[PDB]
Design an enzyme around this catalytic site. Structure first.
Site, PDB file in Angstrom:
ATOM      1  N   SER A 219     -62.052  -0.725  81.038  1.00 21.99           N
ATOM      2  CA  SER A 219     -63.254  -0.169  80.384  1.00 21.99           C
ATOM      3  C   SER A 219     -63.529   1.261  80.894  1.00 21.99           C
ATOM      4  O   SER A 219     -62.672   2.128  80.685  1.00 21.99           O
ATOM      5  CB  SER A 219     -64.429  -1.154  80.542  1.00 21.99           C
ATOM      6  OG  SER A 219     -65.402  -0.935  79.547  1.00 21.99           O
ATOM      7  N   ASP A 242     -58.338  -1.975  77.957  1.00 18.38           N
ATOM      8  CA  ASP A 242     -59.431  -1.765  77.003  1.00 18.38           C
ATOM      9  C   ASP A 242     -60.335  -0.575  77.418  1.00 18.38           C
ATOM     10  O   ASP A 242     -61.523  -0.733  77.698  1.00 18.38           O
ATOM     11  CB  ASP A 242     -60.218  -3.089  76.827  1.00 18.38           C
ATOM     12  CG  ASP A 242     -60.492  -3.435  75.388  1.00 18.38           C
ATOM     13  OD1 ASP A 242     -59.890  -2.856  74.469  1.00 18.38           O
ATOM     14  OD2 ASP A 242     -61.331  -4.312  75.163  1.00 18.38           O
ATOM     15  N   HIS A 297     -63.416  -7.765  74.722  1.00 15.95           N
ATOM     16  CA  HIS A 297     -63.537  -6.852  75.857  1.00 15.95           C
ATOM     17  C   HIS A 297     -63.629  -7.546  77.231  1.00 15.95           C
ATOM     18  O   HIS A 297     -63.095  -7.031  78.217  1.00 15.95           O
ATOM     19  CB  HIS A 297     -64.769  -5.959  75.667  1.00 15.95           C
ATOM     20  CG  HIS A 297     -64.743  -4.706  76.481  1.00 15.95           C
ATOM     21  ND1 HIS A 297     -63.646  -3.876  76.538  1.00 15.95           N
ATOM     22  CD2 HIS A 297     -65.689  -4.146  77.271  1.00 15.95           C
ATOM     23  CE1 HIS A 297     -63.919  -2.860  77.330  1.00 15.95           C
ATOM     24  NE2 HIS A 297     -65.154  -2.998  77.788  1.00 15.95           N
TER      25      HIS A 297
HETATM   26  C1  LIG Z   1     -72.999   6.123  75.106  1.00 14.68           C
HETATM   27  C2  LIG Z   1     -73.387   4.866  75.889  1.00 14.68           C
HETATM   28  C3  LIG Z   1     -74.865   4.524  75.687  1.00 14.68           C
HETATM   29  C4  LIG Z   1     -72.492   3.692  75.502  1.00 14.68           C
HETATM   30  O1  LIG Z   1     -72.345   2.823  76.626  1.00 14.68           O
HETATM   31  C5  LIG Z   1     -71.190   2.082  76.674  1.00 14.68           C
HETATM   32  C6  LIG Z   1     -70.933   1.957  77.999  1.00 14.68           C
HETATM   33  C7  LIG Z   1     -69.795   1.240  78.484  1.00 14.68           C
HETATM   34  O2  LIG Z   1     -69.518   1.097  79.669  1.00 14.68           O
HETATM   35  N1  LIG Z   1     -68.972   0.684  77.500  1.00 14.68           N
HETATM   36  C8  LIG Z   1     -67.789  -0.062  77.955  1.00 14.68           C
HETATM   37  C9  LIG Z   1     -69.195   0.785  76.123  1.00 14.68           C
HETATM   38  O3  LIG Z   1     -68.438   0.277  75.315  1.00 14.68           O
HETATM   39  N2  LIG Z   1     -70.316   1.493  75.728  1.00 14.68           N
HETATM   40  C10 LIG Z   1     -70.565   1.611  74.282  1.00 14.68           C
HETATM   41 CL   LIG Z   2     -65.730  -7.174  72.209  1.00 11.94          CL
END
Ligand SMILES: CC(C)COc1cc(=O)n(C)c(=O)n1C
Ligand SMILES: [Cl-]
Ligand SMILES: [Ca+2]
Ligand SMILES: [Cl-]
EC number: 3.1.1.47
Length: 371
Positions: A219, A242, A297
């Site tokens: 991530s 991912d 995820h």
């Molecule tokens: C732009 C942010 C408010 C979005 O914050 C996320 C954080 C994160 O760690 N991850 C894995 C995400 O998928 N998102 C969309």
């Molecule tokens: Cl997911």
């Protein structure tokens, strides 16, 4: 139950914090151990992580104590402080966790790697992306064990671009430093662990194959892989599990000379994110991507093994694919990629077909269209 490693070696685990500060390194070590009879490792070892996870989830702080009650004595199949299996130089993985996670929550990966003969250093980041982490304010507070806790930072819209990039860059720096620490320890530099544990770091002297080093992460940690590679050539290849690509600057995409492997979930990804992955591609360089069918995820983290099928699917901890099958495919593919790009002389090339997405549960490249 978090699954045991599939490889030949028993697996041990300990924690290392050096120095004691919020700039020092904190990591969880997984390593090939002797066959042994030590207790398994406490998976989430302080109440404050649960409180932090609750803050991450946006729930009432009673959920903290609920999670603590359900999961607070759960273990992972790595023997706590068991002796290092001597007489071989082990390749080293530095592993980076996701946002909301911390060092202990990717033991399924850590253990399986270790069981195939890697030392894995899972870092705990002090960039305020962890749900919680801790450090000591001074030497005396280290000595008596009086912890100071840092909880996840929540950002405003206007801070996002700016702060995420700082964090990923701080993360990169933390990977590099943890690497230098392990190499110092490998050379035999005495190191006082600020955690006062029954594990002799001198066991690790002359035990690291110093040239064979990879960085892996999930991530935010998948982005951390790429920033790290671009910043530190000691890492010879990377595997991004991912990856969330947002934190990265526009400058980094063309600045990754090392081999890089993308292993994606089916349902997390999306064009904006895949487009950035594709910006890392260049014909002179080595890149592969696969996508595990029916995965989410959370399939790469340990919570995919913490609940039953029904509740897990409800909470998006599990996908339609079995979590053991999911993680086996990710780990085995990873092992073949590591063997190829670190020049390991093991049997992991049996999973070369996984790298190219040649399995009924894999998709070569991606299911996401970007046109
Ligand atoms: C732009 C942010 C408010 C979005 O914050 C996320 C954080 C994160 O760690 N991850 C894995 C995400 O998928 N998102 C969309
Ligand atoms: Cl997911
Ligand atoms: Ca550097
Ligand atoms: Cl999009």
């Amino acid at each position: 139950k978090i699954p045991r490693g599939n490889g030949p070696y028993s697996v041990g685990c300990t924690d290392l914090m050096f120095d004691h500060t919020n700039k020092g390194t904190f990591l969880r070590l997984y390593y090939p151990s002797q066959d042994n009879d030590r207790l398994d490792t406490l998976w989430i070892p302080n109440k404050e992580y649960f409180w932090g996870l609750s803050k991450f989830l946006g729930t009432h702080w009673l959920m903290g104590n609920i999670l603590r009650l359900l999961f607070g004595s759960m273990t992972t199949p790595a023997n706590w402080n068991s002796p290092l299996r001597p007489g071989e130089k082990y390749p080293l993985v530095v592993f980076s966790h996701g946002l909301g996670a911390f060092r202990t929550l990717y033991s399924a990966i850590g253990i399986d790697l270790a069981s195939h003969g890697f030392i894995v250093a899972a870092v705990e980041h002090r960039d305020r992306s962890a749900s919680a982490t801790y450090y000591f304010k001074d030497q005396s507070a280290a000595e008596i064990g009086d912890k100071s806790w840092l909880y996840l930072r929540t950002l405003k819209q206007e801070e996002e671009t700016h702060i995420r990039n700082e964090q990923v860059r701080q993360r990169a720096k933390e990977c590099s430093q943890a690497l230098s620490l392990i190499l110092d320890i490998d050379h035999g530099k005495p190191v006082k662990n600020a955690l006062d544990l029954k594990f002799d770091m001198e066991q690790l002297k002359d035990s690291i194959d110093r040239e064979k080093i990879a960085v892996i992460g999930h991530s935010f940690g998948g982005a951390t892989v790429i920033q790290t590679l671009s910043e530190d050539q000691r890492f010879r290849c990377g595997i991004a599990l991912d990856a969330w690509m947002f934190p990265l600057g526009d400058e980094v995409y063309s600045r990754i000379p090392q081999p890089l492997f993308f292993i994606n979930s089916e349902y997390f990804q999306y064009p904006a994110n895949i487009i950035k992955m594709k910006k890392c591609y260049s014909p002179d360089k080595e890149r592969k991507m696969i996508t595990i069918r029916g995965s989410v995820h959370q399939n790469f983290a340990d919570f995919t093994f913490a609940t039953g099928k029904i509740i897990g699917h409800m909470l998006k901890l599990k996908g339609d694919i079995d979590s053991n099958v999911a993680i086996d495919l990710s780990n085995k593919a990873s092992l073949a990629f590591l063997q190829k790009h670190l020049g390991l002389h093991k049997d992991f090339d049996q999973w070369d077909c996984l790298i190219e997405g040649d399995d009924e549960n894999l998709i070569p490249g991606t299911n996401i269209n970007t046109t």
